[PDB]
T-cell receptor, first 241, second 202 residues
Framework: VKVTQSSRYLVKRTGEKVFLECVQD?????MFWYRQDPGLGLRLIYF???????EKGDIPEGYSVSREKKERFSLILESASTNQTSMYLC????????????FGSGTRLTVVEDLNKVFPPEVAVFEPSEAEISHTQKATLVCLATGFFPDHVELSWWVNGKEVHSGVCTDPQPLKEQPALNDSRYSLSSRLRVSATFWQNPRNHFRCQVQFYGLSENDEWTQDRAKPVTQIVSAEAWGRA | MQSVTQLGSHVSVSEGALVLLRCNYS??????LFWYVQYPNQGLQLLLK??????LVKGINGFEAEFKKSETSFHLTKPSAHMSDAAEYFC?????????????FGTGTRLTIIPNIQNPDPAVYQLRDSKSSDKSVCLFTDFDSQTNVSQSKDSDVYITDKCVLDMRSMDFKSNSAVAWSNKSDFACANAFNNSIIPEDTF
């Protein structure tokens, strides 16, 4: 009772033809592909009400679809443009059951006019200001993630091997490292706040983790530098007296 | 199930205040309506649905909506907003009583909740972790939500907007923005600048 999409992000070049799959284990007759854009909510591209059937949504232009088996629903972009840059959402449902839609969990796709522009993030951590600690008896560590294109990162915090959610804020949007360049690179920051005693106890471990999603192994380059593949870049710091 | 609109793509309300998210529909046939919420990181999830089973529908996370046929509306409300309500919200409509057959969504309302900072001691602080290379971040923190951080002017200096962290176990929340540059003539004590409080400590 899950609907799974094939990849959670993907990167592709202008003019290329793109294939996303969706799959579901509930024996559902109905499957739908939407896309999601800020300001525009969800817009239905295509749907299918049985194996081999298809029907245009409100915005099929540029797309084509393929329902081969009862379990699969593929969406196909005839030729990538930057207005197909979006979050793609699959959903499935049953004609008979009274349960409605089950949604997949997205695939973000970004389309660029030049594959050489994608980079991982370098991840630094900054340790608290001594002056905060004394004035408040708390301790804010800051993480920067920098030098990433495209904006595909997922930043988490880890404290003695267990991830944490209390005491954290991350920028909802990153800022543009270079605000003129059309395909400018990106930076993101987060914060982790803890009582200063926690910070003043070198038995405690903190790590800033930044999962990036770039090129898949199939993609093709040879610039001298590492192939910018999906990866986790961390940084860390220990407690301090 | 013909169409839907959500007037107000962005609502910001104080923690504890009334939440109201608009939804209006047109339908040539009998409509069935649905509200979905999408939390920052995760996917879409049913908050509530209307079926011709009663007028005032009650849903998850403390929400409610009224199906008012005489205005073509199904507005989402919650009397007292919680930090954890921050999310994007979508109204949909279907011709099927269960939402099996195609849903038409509206355009979304982004909900932002404004923390009530209790005892603010605003300050700018210098952090440098001594791995020290192309390094010096400045933290402006513990300010009141009255205060907004304005963008950069020197285009080679970076400020991030304010963010809100909550140390649940100490029923304590606090706002912060970060600023940084590699430039040698750059100082925390003159890095932030705008809509800024005199009592800022250093």
């Amino acid at each position: 009772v899950k609907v799974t999409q094939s990849s959670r992000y993907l990167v592709k070049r202008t003019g290329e033809k793109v294939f996303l799959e969706c799959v579901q284990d509930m024996d559902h007759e109905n499957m739908f592909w939407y896309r999601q854009d800020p300001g525009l909510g969800l817009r239905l591209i295509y749907f299918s009400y049985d194996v081999k059937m298809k029907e245009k949504g409100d915005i099929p232009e540029g797309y084509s679809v393929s329902r081969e088996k009862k379990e699969r629903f593929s969406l196909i972009l005839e030729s990538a443009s930057t207005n197909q840059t979006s979050m793609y959402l699959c959903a499935s449902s049953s004609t008979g059951l009274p349960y409605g839609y089950t949604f997949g969990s997205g695939t973000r796709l970004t389309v660029v006019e030049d594959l050489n522009k994608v980079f991982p993030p370098e991840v630094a951590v900054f340790e608290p200001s001594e002056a905060e600690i004394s004035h408040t008896q708390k301790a804010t560590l800051v993480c920067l993630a920098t030098g990433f294109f495209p904006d595909h990162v997922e930043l988490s915090w880890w404290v003695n091997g267990k991830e944490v959610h209390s005491g954290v804020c991350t920028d909802p949007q990153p800022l543009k490292e270079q605000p003129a360049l059309n395909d400018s690179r990106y930076s993101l920051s987060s914060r982790l706040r803890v009582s200063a005693t926690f910070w003043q106890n070198p038995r405690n471990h903190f790590r800033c983790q930044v999962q990036f999603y770039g090129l898949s192994e199939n993609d093709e380059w040879t610039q001298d530098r590492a192939k910018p593949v999906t990866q986790i870049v961390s940084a860390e710091a220990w407690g301090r007296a | 199930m013909q169409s839907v609109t959500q007037l107000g793509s962005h609502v910001s309300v104080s923690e504890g205040a009334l939440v109201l998210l608009r939804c209006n529909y047109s339908s040539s046939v009998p409509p069935y309506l649905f509200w979905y919420v999408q939390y920052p990181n995760q996917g879409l999830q049913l908050l509530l649905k209307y079926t011709s089973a009663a007028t005032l529908v009650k849903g998850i996370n403390g929400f409610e909506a009224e199906f008012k046929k005489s205005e073509t509306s199904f507005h989402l409300t919650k009397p007292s907003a919680h930090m954890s309500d921050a999310a994007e919200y979508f109204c949909a409509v279907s011709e099927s009583p269960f939402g099996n057959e195609k849903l038409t969504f509206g355009t979304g309302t982004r909900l932002t909740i404004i923390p009530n900072i209790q005892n603010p001691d605003p300050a700018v602080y210098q952090l440098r972790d001594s791995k020290s290379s192309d390094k010096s971040v400045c933290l402006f923190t513990d300010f009141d939500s009255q205060t907004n951080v304005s963008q950069s002017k020197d285009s080679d200096v970076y400020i991030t907007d304010k963010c809100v962290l909550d140390m649940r176990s100490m029923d304590f929340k606090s706002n912060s923005a970060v600023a940084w540059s590699n430039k040698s003539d750059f100082a925390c004590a003159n890095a932030f600048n705008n809509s800024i409080i005199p009592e800022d400590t250093f």
